[PDB]
Design an enzyme around this catalytic site. Structure first.
Site, PDB file in Angstrom:
ATOM      1  N   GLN A  67     -11.767   6.017  -6.344  1.00  0.00           N
ATOM      2  CA  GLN A  67     -12.444   6.632  -5.216  1.00  0.00           C
ATOM      3  C   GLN A  67     -13.823   7.106  -5.678  1.00  0.00           C
ATOM      4  OE1 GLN A  67      -9.930   9.534  -3.362  1.00  0.00           O
ATOM      5  NE2 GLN A  67      -8.655   8.009  -2.333  1.00  0.00           N
ATOM      6  N   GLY A 109       0.536   4.350   1.463  1.00  0.00           N
ATOM      7  CA  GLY A 109       0.572   5.237   2.590  1.00  0.00           C
ATOM      8  C   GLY A 109      -0.618   6.163   2.689  1.00  0.00           C
ATOM      9  N   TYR A 129      -3.909   5.747   2.891  1.00  0.00           N
ATOM     10  CA  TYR A 129      -4.935   5.425   3.881  1.00  0.00           C
ATOM     11  C   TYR A 129      -4.375   5.417   5.298  1.00  0.00           C
ATOM     12  CZ  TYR A 129      -8.358   2.557   6.463  1.00  0.00           C
ATOM     13  OH  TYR A 129      -9.253   2.072   7.401  1.00  0.00           O
ATOM     14  N   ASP A 189      -2.806   8.064  -2.909  1.00  0.00           N
ATOM     15  CA  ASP A 189      -4.113   8.703  -2.993  1.00  0.00           C
ATOM     16  C   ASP A 189      -4.342   9.568  -1.758  1.00  0.00           C
ATOM     17  OD1 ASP A 189      -4.237   6.336  -1.382  1.00  0.00           O
ATOM     18  OD2 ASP A 189      -6.290   5.892  -2.008  1.00  0.00           O
ATOM     19  N   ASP A 207      -7.290  -8.265   0.960  1.00  0.00           N
ATOM     20  CA  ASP A 207      -6.382  -8.277   2.103  1.00  0.00           C
ATOM     21  C   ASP A 207      -7.164  -7.869   3.340  1.00  0.00           C
ATOM     22  OD1 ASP A 207      -6.144  -5.198   1.286  1.00  0.00           O
ATOM     23  OD2 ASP A 207      -5.409  -5.372   3.335  1.00  0.00           O
ATOM     24  N   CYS A 239      -4.788 -28.401  12.661  1.00  0.00           N
ATOM     25  CA  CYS A 239      -5.931 -29.275  12.824  1.00  0.00           C
ATOM     26  C   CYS A 239      -5.546 -30.739  12.682  1.00  0.00           C
ATOM     27  CB  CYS A 239      -7.028 -28.875  11.837  1.00  0.00           C
ATOM     28  SG  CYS A 239      -7.785 -27.241  12.261  1.00  0.00           S
ATOM     29  N   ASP A 288       0.843  -1.180   0.000  1.00  0.00           N
ATOM     30  CA  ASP A 288       0.000   0.000   0.000  1.00  0.00           C
ATOM     31  C   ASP A 288       0.889   1.244   0.000  1.00  0.00           C
ATOM     32  OD1 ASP A 288      -2.219   1.593  -0.028  1.00  0.00           O
ATOM     33  OD2 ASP A 288      -2.999   0.957   1.941  1.00  0.00           O
ATOM     34  N   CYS A 316     -10.739 -28.983   8.116  1.00  0.00           N
ATOM     35  CA  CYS A 316      -9.566 -28.211   7.750  1.00  0.00           C
ATOM     36  C   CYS A 316      -8.345 -29.109   7.605  1.00  0.00           C
ATOM     37  CB  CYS A 316      -9.320 -27.147   8.828  1.00  0.00           C
ATOM     38  SG  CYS A 316      -7.850 -26.122   8.577  1.00  0.00           S
TER      39      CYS A 316
END
Ligand SMILES: CC#C[C@H]1NC(N)=Nc2cc3[nH]c(NC)nc3cc21
Ligand SMILES: CC#C[C@H]1NC(N)=Nc2cc3[nH]c(NC)nc3cc21
Ligand SMILES: [Zn+2]
Ligand SMILES: [Zn+2]
Lengths: 369, 369
Positions: free
Chosen positions: A189, A95, A97, A145, A266, A309, A93, A304
């Site tokens: 956006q 930065g 946000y 952004d 994510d 497990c 990412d 699983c």
């Protein structure tokens, strides 16, 4: 040699797609879930364990790593991959946000801010964000952004983000090593407003990116609203490129978002809530600290395939988490990340067999029973 | 089938010995170091990782497990081995030392006490301690002793412990499954006093045990004093049985204790101080949080064969520990336990080659440079 970035759709069902992204450091099966590795670690897991659960790619963060340990330092030590010991793709990412979420001053040039860690002062801009991601050696670079509910005002932030998307593109293309070996995604956006989402999608497609993220979601809007926004937003994006929903989410969110055309995901939920005692199962989540598990010899989930497990009981993991033992966090986290990857595998197989609609119905009926 | 308990000395150098203890769940190479697993986990390690470092046997605690999760509960869930997923030998301390260290009322019958965890009230005695260790399924059972510097008074505690050692022997021999599948060790007391150590050794040898621990040390006495006590105490024990020094210790303590006839060791230092940022190396311990390691690309130790030193740098582990990341604790702990096991391997090989004297000199010269 392998390609820089090649997305190929192998099958579709409705708006859902399944396929692969080939990159120099490996192949990414889509729809994909990225474990979050904000501090250059997926919390409580060795990278070999992350891979063993099925992950093809992990997420890192410009904001956290520029502060600790530092971007130039990571570059001097040989890059993020070598530093943390994960040799497969990494998406970072930008930065935008995290600067807003974690003491800031906004302008057309960028953002100056005070670190939640040191109180030290720092700057980010499209050009600095792209440089930082180059220093880290990211494989998928996110555009920088501006991030802020909103009037009206949402349009001001969206339009600036589109100007910053062009600057991100140009900064990336100016760095030859980056442009030849990495990919660049733009961020759509426009909040809940169909017309702004369209203006944003148009601007990004005119610039041209390797993939398109849907921003402005997983910020507390409720699943109904998120799905409503995806209904009209994802069709606006180029069909032939990957669609990345940032920060999503719960299993039920992921399934519904794939039904609406998302390819990449994510979130911190499997890791963070695992440490807090919440285990995901096909019959819904359970809280392993609850006293009902103190003598339960079954595994966390009865189907699983994960190593946790295969070997340990609910009763043992209950004891560990109650005692505050590190092994508790380790085992809960491995299981939850493995569960998420098995969910993604089931999604991919069902789309490729043309029975994803039936899988989604069956999944929800059992998970919410 | 394998033997219940067979100790065989393969080589000697001075008072030092090297050999094997064969037991039903595996072979224990001596001199041996036991990682500590007080809460039914070796902190921050899966049992497969404990084994990978070279450990043949781990230590558990009657006192902690009787409180959480409970002895009868562990038995209902199939025993301590199945519960925590370690299928090799386990030695359990009897509770005598931990009851004193962690609100108590002493008598000839036993001890009543208040738990540091719940405030609940509990009782221990020779018979209850042996029963608890049977419920856990321990392979090496420790006799229950009374623990208290002392006048004079040390003799009162030692004599009671010898009466409790006989009751421990009888309780163990009354439980057929235990006596056929497990071993029982006695604990020598007598503090710093040669005559009391002799009286204690005589009493234990008259009763007869599979092995003999040296109690009353690693309680803050300084290495000079500990070595002085071992000098006269260990020769008093039966030569043909293992000698176990409880709670020791630092690498330099272990080497000197082997020079004085000790075969078995346990302590929390490699695990606890690993989590706190201290890494053991052949050039002495280092504190990985120190700023000098922030850009150090070398492994924790330049010779160590452990998985941590094959893959990650000091600089990365520095970052993790500074950030409070769980993976930091995991990697530091694996390395430190592997270092301890490599120390024990070097001790065993040097005794078997008749060059342990030279190893000890070389080790101290480099470690303390
Ligand atoms: C408007 C906008 C936007 C997107 N912009 C950037 N740079 N990163 C994101 C990360 C997110 N995480 C979550 N929820 C946890 N929503 C996100 C949204 C964004
Ligand atoms: C007198 C006496 C005695 C021994 N008695 C029992 N039951 N356990 C022990 C454990 C120890 N740990 C350390 N130091 C950490 N010294 C120990 C001594 C004993
Ligand atoms: Zn699992
Ligand atoms: Zn190592």
């Amino acid at each position: 040699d392998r390609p820089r970035f090649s997305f190929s759709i192998a099958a579709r069902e409705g708006k859902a797609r399944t396929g692969t992204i080939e990159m120099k450091r490996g192949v990414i099966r889509t729809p994909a879930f990225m474990p979050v590795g904000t501090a250059a670690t997926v919390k409580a897991l060795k990278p070999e364990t992350v891979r063993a659960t099925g992950a093809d790619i992990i997420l890192g963060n410009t904001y956290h790593l520029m502060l600790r340990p530092g971007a130039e330092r990571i570059a001097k030590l040989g890059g993020l991959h070598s530093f943390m010991g994960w040799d497969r793709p990494i998406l970072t990412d930008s930065g935008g946000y995290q600067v807003m979420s974690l003491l800031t001053k906004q302008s057309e040039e960028g953002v100056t801010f005070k670190s939640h860690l040191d109180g030290s002062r720092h700057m980010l801009s499209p050009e600095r964000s792209i440089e930082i991601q180059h220093l880290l050696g990211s494989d998928i670079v996110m555009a920088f952004d501006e991030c802020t509910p909103a009037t009206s005002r949402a349009a001001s932030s969206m339009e600036r983000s589109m100007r910053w998307a062009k600057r991100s593109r140009d900064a990336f293309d100016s760095r030859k090593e980056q442009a030849e070996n990495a990919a660049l995604f733009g961020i759509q956006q426009g909040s809940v407003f169909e017309n702004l989402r369209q203006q944003s999608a148009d601007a990004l497609a005119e610039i041209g990116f390797d993939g398109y993220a849907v921003g402005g979601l997983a910020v507390g809007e409720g699943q109904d609203e998120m799905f409503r926004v995806l209904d009209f937003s994802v069709p606006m994006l180029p069909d032939d490129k990957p669609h990345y929903l940032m920060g999503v989410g719960k299993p039920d969110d992921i399934v519904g978002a794939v039904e609406r055309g998302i390819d990449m995901f994510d979130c911190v939920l499997p890791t963070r809530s695992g440490r807090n005692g919440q285990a995901f199962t096909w019959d819904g989540p359970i809280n392993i600290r609850n006293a009902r598990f103190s003598e339960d010899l079954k595994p966390l989930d009865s189907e699983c395939h994960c190593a946790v497990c295969q070997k340990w009981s609910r009763a043992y993991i209950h004891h560990l988490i109650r005692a505050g033992e590190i092994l508790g966090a380790m085992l809960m986290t491995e299981h939850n990340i493995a569960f998420y990857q098995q969910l993604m595998q089931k999604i991919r197989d069902s789309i490729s067999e043309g029975r994803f609609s039936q899988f989604a119905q069956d999944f929800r009926a059992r998970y919410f029973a």
